[PDB]
Amino acid sequence: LNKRLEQIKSWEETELSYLQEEAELAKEEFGDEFSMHEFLKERTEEVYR
């Protein structure tokens, strides 16, 4: 269980790292207006969940 939980947290911290690049990869091309903060605020806690 321990060695599994450490992989789970490493997975989570790699996904949170990928998220910063994915935010400007796939959210700034979505609308004429800029509300980038809420996209990260939502899918960060999606990664947490």
List the determination method. cryo-EM
Tell me the structure's resolution in angstroms, rounded to a single decimal.
2.7
Q: How many Å apart are CA 33 and CA 5, to the nearest integer?
A: 40
Contact 33, 21 (CB under 8 A): no
Contact 40, 19 (CB under 8 A): yes
Cα 20–Cα 47–Cα 40 angle in degrees, nearest 5: 40
Tokens of 38: 């809420």
Terminal alpha carbon distance of the chain: 19
Q: How many Å apart are CA 47 and CA 21, to the nearest integer?
A: 15
Distances (CA, A) of 21 to 18, 24, 38, 42: 6, 6, 15, 15
How many other C-beta atoms can be found within 10 angstroms of the C-beta atom of residue 27?
16
Dihedral of CA atoms 7, 13, 16, 18 in degrees, nearest 10, equals -80
